[PDB]
Ligand binder design. Sequence first.
Ligand SMILES: [Mg+2]
Ligand SMILES: [Mg+2]
Ligand SMILES: [Mg+2]
Ligand SMILES: [Mg+2]
Ligand SMILES: [Mg+2]
Ligand SMILES: [Mg+2]
Ligand SMILES: [Mg+2]
Ligand SMILES: [Mg+2]
Ligand SMILES: [Mg+2]
Ligand SMILES: [Mg+2]
Ligand SMILES: [Mg+2]
Ligand SMILES: [Mg+2]
Ligand SMILES: [Mg+2]
Ligand SMILES: [Mg+2]
Ligand SMILES: [Mg+2]
Ligand SMILES: [Mg+2]
Ligand SMILES: [Mg+2]
Ligand SMILES: [Mg+2]
Ligand SMILES: [Mg+2]
Ligand SMILES: [Mg+2]
Ligand SMILES: [Mg+2]
Ligand SMILES: [Mg+2]
Ligand SMILES: [Mg+2]
Ligand SMILES: [Mg+2]
Lengths: 258, 130, 181
Amino acid sequence: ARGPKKHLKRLAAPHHWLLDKLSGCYAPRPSAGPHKLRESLPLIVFLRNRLKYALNGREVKAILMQRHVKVDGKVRTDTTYPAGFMDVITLDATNENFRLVYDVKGRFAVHRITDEEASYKLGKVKKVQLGKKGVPYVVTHDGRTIRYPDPNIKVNDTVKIDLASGKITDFIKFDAGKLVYVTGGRNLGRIGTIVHKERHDGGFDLVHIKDSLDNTFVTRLNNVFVIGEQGKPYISLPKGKGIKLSIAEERDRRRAQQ
Amino acid sequence: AVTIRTRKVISNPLLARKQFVVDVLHPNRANVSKDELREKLAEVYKAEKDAVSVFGFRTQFGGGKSVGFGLVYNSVAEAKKFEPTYRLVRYGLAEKVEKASRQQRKQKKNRDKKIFGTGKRLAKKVARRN
Amino acid sequence: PRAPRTYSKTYSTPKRPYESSRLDAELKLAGEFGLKNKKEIYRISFQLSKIRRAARDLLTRDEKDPKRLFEGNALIRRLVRVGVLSEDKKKLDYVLALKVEDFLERRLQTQVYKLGLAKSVHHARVLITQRHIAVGKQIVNIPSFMVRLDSEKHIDFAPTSPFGGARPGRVARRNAARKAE
RNA sequence: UAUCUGGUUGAUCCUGCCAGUAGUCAUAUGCUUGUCUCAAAGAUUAAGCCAUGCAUGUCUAAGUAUAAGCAAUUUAUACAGUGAAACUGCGAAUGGCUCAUUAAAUCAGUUAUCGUUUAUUUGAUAGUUUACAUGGUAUAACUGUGGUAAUUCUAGA
RNA sequence: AUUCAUAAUAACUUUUCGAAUCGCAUGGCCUUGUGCUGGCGAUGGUUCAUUCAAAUUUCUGCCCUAUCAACUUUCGAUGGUAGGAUAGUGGCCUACCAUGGUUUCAACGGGUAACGGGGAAUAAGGGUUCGAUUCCGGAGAGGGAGCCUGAGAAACGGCUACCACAUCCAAGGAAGGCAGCAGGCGCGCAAAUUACCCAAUCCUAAUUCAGGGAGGUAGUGACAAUAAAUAACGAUACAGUUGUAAUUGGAAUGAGUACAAUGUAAAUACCUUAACGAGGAACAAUUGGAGGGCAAGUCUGGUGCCAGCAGCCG
RNA sequence: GUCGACGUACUUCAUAGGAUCA
Ligand SMILES: [Mg+2]
Ligand SMILES: [Mg+2]
Ligand SMILES: [Mg+2]
Ligand SMILES: [Mg+2]
Ligand SMILES: [Mg+2]
Ligand SMILES: [Mg+2]
Ligand SMILES: [Mg+2]
Ligand SMILES: [Mg+2]
Ligand SMILES: [Mg+2]
Ligand SMILES: [Mg+2]
Ligand SMILES: [Mg+2]
Ligand SMILES: [Mg+2]
Ligand SMILES: [Mg+2]
Ligand SMILES: [Mg+2]
Ligand SMILES: [Mg+2]
Ligand SMILES: [Mg+2]
Ligand SMILES: [Mg+2]
Ligand SMILES: [Mg+2]
Ligand SMILES: [Mg+2]
Ligand SMILES: [Mg+2]
Ligand SMILES: [Mg+2]
Ligand SMILES: [Mg+2]
Ligand SMILES: [Mg+2]
Ligand SMILES: [Mg+2]
């Protein structure tokens, strides 16, 4: 190619969007934004294919141009705005607030939240560095640059960002016994407690996570997101509480509830 | 008799309307016109007929029932504002715009691309030359 | 372009089409169940082969193997639901013992014959293709329709059918009009 | 190969042998071709040659209208409704097609940029630089005068 | 892990940036001035970070060929130093230096009807073959060479030369690139429509609206696949409880025709459905193979009257 | 030139044996 691509075939689109393979030939390409392409849910798919509010792309554009959709407390109008992990989607007319969280199956789940819990978000500190004029700043997983951080905040910590002011309200250190959420890999969507961090200089760090059912799994450190202390999450978790269930047990539960 | 049932009803304030699936049981009848269903839905939901839209009617194999998707807007102005132009034309709320076939429009676009400026000067020049 | 739509063959030619015993068995099956051509027998043989191969493969695995338990339970459930496998025979061993005739038995043509609506299997086929038979509230015009245990009790003449309480067909009212004239 | 059929002599058995009978896929071709659903369209190693037509343009309240544009108007003697043409900005490097070249090349998996550029999006970020606001160091569209057989040709004022 | 982030000192610059831009609206202070102050947005702008990307890059993995055994090095091949260039590392190039680098563990050379992969076929398993072709990545736009613009191009539905073709011409000149969608030629023997639409998918723009042969819709050789009509129930007759009906009775139904409605951007079609639509149900199912029998008939041969060939012809 | 060698492709000849019976 001679430049950046602007099209996305349906088959090449991220699996977890759950797009029909025969509805069309192309899929929404998320525009550049806070989140990466493969780890983002564009607003069109959220409003049309998940909430079923809009029947087709044109109605989604009609919704957005009315300025009813807010992402992280700011109005967005791009149909392909890449909403992602820990972003708050507010629809005032419906009096609805959503937080985008992966369910156990690894897909973004429609999770309804109260307004108070919608007042803030959580961000993984991706970088801590001194800016120009000797001003420290922190860059989070969603690309927010926050100046004058608390000095104790280090990389891989979690910061609770208030959306109204864009400032850090509190922070959680990455330590053993903390509650964490998996945001990548085959263990995507699971929740557990840290047990031990293996360090490999010049390589990818590994973290052992024990679930509430005492099952253990190892995951690369880049895919871990600290969300609180054990039993005291700082956000409301989706149904299932991040517990992975075997196929047989899922069958049993499904038959029972039916 | 004919019985209309509304199912999977969603209330969308964003588009200012109500979505649902309409199931029509029509024994001993071929099927029901969209106009009659629009009237009946308007009566049941207490709205203008102009504010009711219906489509996607496919009588199942063996006949006797039809299934499609139905919309009830809060007031007629919103119906005109959000409804697709073609569905408005179906209902008579809007008039079809007459336009030439795509080939003619594209050829005219190319011929205009050929000319630069208003073209009156070219007309006067050719008139003087000949 | 648009993503592919999958397709598959539902039948395969037997290893030996020319065996005399096979020809005789096909003749017997076709006559007993009123099958149009050998393609139906080949189709049902293909399905039964697929199920029995799957049953073999699951049996090969160790007992209590989670894949074995799950897949065997699902297969036995499906076979019991469709009526081929009886309630008391819920073991993969008895799945492996199935025969083609059991599948031919569940066909809507055979069931329509057995329940007494038709005087011949061919009469049942003609009735089915002429839109006279309804499973539940629904008209079915496919002889190869496989009837479930729940659905077997709801086979009846369709409401729209002249035999089901509707108006007489074209021939009947035509003759009545001619007689009246 | 397999099973089955037939020959192996004056006949019948038991061997052995021989001939024919298996397969889908692929190419070409013949005959037929009523209904429902669904779906594809290369090939002369000729990436050989193409008539004609179309396939990339784009304007919001929010860059520039004294169009001698349209329509309302005394809800405006600076403009303000709509708006051709042109300047300006953006796009045209996406998409679509083909497999000629290419044998550690491409490509697959896996690494690195403490070795570098990055329109755009998102978030931060600049009291330190006649002003009730500077020029043509300037032109398009437009008016008018013209050249060529001819072209998305353009010359002077 | 750093000469990292950042800061500071002294200077330097054809040297930048630090809002001379636009819409909507008319709030608050008073010393009552078209005084001071002030809201909601658009578009610009330095640097950092993020995102879409780009470039180079580490390890391992490619079919046939040894009757290709030595190759690379003069004109860069291996490495050092300094410089030029690059967005940047680097023999990428320049100048001076050394003589290096690969190879029977197959280098180098040759063939390839060689784009690579996800995959497809077969097989009991090992294996064998195919993969132009719905997705990913690479290269190209008749063949070489070279560039403006722009963040992004060695672009070709951008430009310039040359090579080859080829169009207009008043002979002075001008204009070319279907391996995009349709549609032609390449033979004297052949095969989809120069159709409709942006309604769904998403993409482009100053942008809800315009545009999109990308794409969708329909048309068209049985590509490859699914289901599935062409009759069912009786009576009578004839013939050696079986077979045969241009025998016979009234019941059912869709191929097709068609009000209507549904469907669609508008249509066609499907599913529905008033009304028509069956006895040779002539509403006339096909493709292959095997075996007969007949004459004042024909040919050929002979241990009479026969045998072979064959028989649309007597 | 109905030439030699080689390469390639095809054709062809070598199948009856034991037991019983007349
Ligand atoms: Mg690292
Ligand atoms: Mg009927
Ligand atoms: Mg033919
Ligand atoms: Mg027919
Ligand atoms: Mg029909
Ligand atoms: Mg080579
Ligand atoms: Mg390599
Ligand atoms: Mg842009
Ligand atoms: Mg910015
Ligand atoms: Mg001038
Ligand atoms: Mg040198
Ligand atoms: Mg150097
Ligand atoms: Mg090739
Ligand atoms: Mg290949
Ligand atoms: Mg390929
Ligand atoms: Mg190229
Ligand atoms: Mg060509
Ligand atoms: Mg080029
Ligand atoms: Mg192009
Ligand atoms: Mg072209
Ligand atoms: Mg073409
Ligand atoms: Mg096409
Ligand atoms: Mg603007
Ligand atoms: Mg048809």
